[PDB]
Coordinates of C-alpha atoms and ligand atoms in Angstrom, one line a residue:
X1 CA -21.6 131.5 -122.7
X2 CA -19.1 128.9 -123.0
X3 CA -17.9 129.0 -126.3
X4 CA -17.2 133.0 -125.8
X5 CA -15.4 132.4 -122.9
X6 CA -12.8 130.3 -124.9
X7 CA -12.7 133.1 -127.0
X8 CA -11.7 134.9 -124.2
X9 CA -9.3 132.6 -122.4
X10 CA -7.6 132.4 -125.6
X11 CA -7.0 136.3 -126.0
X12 CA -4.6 136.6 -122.7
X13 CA -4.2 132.7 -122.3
X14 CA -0.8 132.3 -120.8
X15 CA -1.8 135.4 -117.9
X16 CA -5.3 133.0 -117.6
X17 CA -3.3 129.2 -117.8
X18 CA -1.0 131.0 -114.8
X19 CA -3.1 132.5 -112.8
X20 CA -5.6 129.6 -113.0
X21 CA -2.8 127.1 -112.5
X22 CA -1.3 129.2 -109.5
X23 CA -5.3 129.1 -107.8
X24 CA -5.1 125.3 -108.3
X25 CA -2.1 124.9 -106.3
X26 CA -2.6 127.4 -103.6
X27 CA -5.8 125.9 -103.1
X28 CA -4.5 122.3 -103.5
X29 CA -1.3 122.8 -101.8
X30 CA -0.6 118.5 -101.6
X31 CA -1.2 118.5 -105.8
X32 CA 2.4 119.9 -105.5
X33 CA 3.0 115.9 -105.0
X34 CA 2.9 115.9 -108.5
X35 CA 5.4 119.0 -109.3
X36 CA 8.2 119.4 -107.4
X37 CA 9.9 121.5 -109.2
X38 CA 6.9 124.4 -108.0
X39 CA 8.0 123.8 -103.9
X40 CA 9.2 126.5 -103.0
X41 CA 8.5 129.5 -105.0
X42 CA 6.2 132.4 -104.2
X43 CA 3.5 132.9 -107.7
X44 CA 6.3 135.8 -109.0
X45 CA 8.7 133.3 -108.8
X46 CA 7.1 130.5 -110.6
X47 CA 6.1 133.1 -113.7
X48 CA 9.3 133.5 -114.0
X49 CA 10.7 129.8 -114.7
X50 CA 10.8 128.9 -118.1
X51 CA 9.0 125.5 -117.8
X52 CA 6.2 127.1 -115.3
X53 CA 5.0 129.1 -118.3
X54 CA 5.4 126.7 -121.2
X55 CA 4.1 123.7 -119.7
X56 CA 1.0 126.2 -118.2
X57 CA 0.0 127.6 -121.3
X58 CA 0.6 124.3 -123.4
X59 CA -1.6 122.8 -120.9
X60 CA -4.2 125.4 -121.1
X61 CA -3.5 125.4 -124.9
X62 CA -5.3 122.0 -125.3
X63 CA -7.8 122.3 -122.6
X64 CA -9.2 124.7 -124.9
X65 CA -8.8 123.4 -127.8
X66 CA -10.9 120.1 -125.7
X67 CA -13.3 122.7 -124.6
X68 CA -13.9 123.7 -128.2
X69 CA -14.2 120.6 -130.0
X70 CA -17.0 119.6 -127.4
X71 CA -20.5 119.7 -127.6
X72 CA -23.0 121.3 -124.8
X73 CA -20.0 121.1 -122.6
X74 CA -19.1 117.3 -123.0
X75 CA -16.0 116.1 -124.5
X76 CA -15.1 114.2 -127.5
X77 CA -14.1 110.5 -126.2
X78 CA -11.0 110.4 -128.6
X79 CA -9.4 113.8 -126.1
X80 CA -10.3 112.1 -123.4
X81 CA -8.1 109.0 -124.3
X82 CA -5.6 111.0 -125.2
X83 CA -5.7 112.9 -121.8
X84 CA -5.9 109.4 -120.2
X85 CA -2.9 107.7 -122.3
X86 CA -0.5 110.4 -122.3
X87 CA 2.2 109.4 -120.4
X88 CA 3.0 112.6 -118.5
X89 CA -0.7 112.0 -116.7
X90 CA 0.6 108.5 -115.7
X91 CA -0.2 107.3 -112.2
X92 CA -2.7 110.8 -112.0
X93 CA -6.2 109.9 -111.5
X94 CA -10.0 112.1 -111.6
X95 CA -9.8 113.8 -108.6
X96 CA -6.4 115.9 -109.9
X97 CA -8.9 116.8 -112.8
X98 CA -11.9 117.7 -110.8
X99 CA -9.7 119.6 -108.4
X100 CA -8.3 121.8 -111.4
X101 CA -11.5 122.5 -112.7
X102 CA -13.3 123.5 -109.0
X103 CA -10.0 126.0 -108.7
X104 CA -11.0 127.4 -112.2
X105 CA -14.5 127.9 -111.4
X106 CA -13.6 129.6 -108.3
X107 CA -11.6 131.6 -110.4
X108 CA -14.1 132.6 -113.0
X109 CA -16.7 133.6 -110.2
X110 CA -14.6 135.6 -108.6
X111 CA -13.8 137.5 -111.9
X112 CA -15.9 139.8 -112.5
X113 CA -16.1 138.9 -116.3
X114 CA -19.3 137.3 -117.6
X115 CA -17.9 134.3 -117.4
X116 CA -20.5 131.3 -117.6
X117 CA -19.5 129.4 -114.6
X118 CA -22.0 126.9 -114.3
X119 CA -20.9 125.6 -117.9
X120 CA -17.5 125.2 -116.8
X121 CA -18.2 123.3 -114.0
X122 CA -20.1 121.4 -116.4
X123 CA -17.1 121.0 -118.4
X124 CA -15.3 119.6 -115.5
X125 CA -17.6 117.2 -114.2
X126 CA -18.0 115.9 -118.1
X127 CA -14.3 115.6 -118.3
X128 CA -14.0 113.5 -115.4
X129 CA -17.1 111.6 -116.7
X130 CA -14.8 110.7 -119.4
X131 CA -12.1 110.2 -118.5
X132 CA -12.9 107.6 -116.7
X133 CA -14.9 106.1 -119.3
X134 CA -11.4 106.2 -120.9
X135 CA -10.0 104.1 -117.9
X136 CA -8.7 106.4 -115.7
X137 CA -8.6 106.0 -112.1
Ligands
MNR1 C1 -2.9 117.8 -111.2 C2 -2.4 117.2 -112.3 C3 -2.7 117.5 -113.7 C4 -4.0 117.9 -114.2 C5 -5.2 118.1 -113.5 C6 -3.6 118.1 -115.6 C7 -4.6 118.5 -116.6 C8 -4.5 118.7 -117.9 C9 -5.5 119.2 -118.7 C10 -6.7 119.4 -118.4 C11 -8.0 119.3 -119.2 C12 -4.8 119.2 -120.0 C13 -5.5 119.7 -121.4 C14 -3.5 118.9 -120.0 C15 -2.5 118.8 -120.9 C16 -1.1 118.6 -120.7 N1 -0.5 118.1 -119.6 MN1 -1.5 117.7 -117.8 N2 -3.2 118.4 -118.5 N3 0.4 117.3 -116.9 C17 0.5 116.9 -115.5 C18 -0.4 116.9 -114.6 C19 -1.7 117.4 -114.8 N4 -2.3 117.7 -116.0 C20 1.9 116.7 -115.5 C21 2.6 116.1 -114.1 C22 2.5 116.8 -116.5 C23 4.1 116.7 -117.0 C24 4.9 117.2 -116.1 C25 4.9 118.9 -116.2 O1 4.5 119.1 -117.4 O2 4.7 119.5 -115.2 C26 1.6 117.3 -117.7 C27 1.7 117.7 -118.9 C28 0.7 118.2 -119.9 C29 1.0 118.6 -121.2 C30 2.4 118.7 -121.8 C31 3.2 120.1 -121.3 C32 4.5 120.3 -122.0 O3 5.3 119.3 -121.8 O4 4.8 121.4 -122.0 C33 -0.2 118.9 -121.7 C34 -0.3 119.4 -123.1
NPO2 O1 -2.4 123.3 -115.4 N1 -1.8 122.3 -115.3 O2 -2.6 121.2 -114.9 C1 -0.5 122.1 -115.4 C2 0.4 123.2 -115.5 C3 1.8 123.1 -115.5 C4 2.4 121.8 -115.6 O3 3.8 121.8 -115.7 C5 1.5 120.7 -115.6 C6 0.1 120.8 -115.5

């Protein structure tokens, strides 16, 4: 279930935070808007800039860290004010969030690990909930 597959994102996470992270913006190609340094770069190419892979896996780092501290998929309210203040997420509004999360899901079906899907798009659709609770746009 859910909780496992943290477990299991977190055994490879930086290979998972890429490759997840590279779906979103192949998918998403305009979400680019919002890192230009990426223009440009074929996925090789972007796995092999140092900020690519720290920011990635420090990003994916506290999504499951999120994901684990939540209950039957929903999110504690203080992470999602924190994911709504920080100030690297200013001006960024739900519909970046919900378009990660759809390119995850994607991801995880396509796998074929027992990934539990439907909880993750749970998880998305919980974190937008709150995060606009929280005041985000
Ligand atoms: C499509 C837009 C974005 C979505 C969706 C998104 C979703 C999430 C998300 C999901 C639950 C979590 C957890 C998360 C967490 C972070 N996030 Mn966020 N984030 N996020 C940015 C846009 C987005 N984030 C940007 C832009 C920056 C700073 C610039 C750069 O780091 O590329 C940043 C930065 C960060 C950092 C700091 C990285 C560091 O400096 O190395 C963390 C941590
Ligand atoms: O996965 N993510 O949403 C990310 C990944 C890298 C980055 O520099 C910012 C956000």
């Amino acid at each position: 279930g859910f909780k496992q597959d943290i477990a299991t994102l977190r055994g490879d996470l930086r290979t998972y935070a890429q490759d997840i992270f590279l779906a979103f913006l192949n998918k998403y190609p305009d979400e680019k808007r919002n890192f230009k340094n990426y223009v440009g770069k074929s996925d090789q190419e972007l796995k092999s800039m140092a900020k690519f892979g720290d920011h990635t896996e420090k990003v994916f780092n506290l999504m499951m860290e999120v994901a684990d501290r939540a209950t039957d998929c929903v999110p504690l309210a203080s992470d999602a004010s924190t994911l709504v203040q920080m100030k690297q997420h200013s001006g960024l509004t739900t519909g970046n969030f919900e378009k990660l999360f759809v390119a995850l899901v994607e991801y995880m079906r396509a796998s074929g690990q027992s990934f539990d899907s439907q909880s993750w798009d749970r998880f998305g659709k919980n974190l937008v909930s709150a995060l606009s609770s929280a005041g985000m746009k």
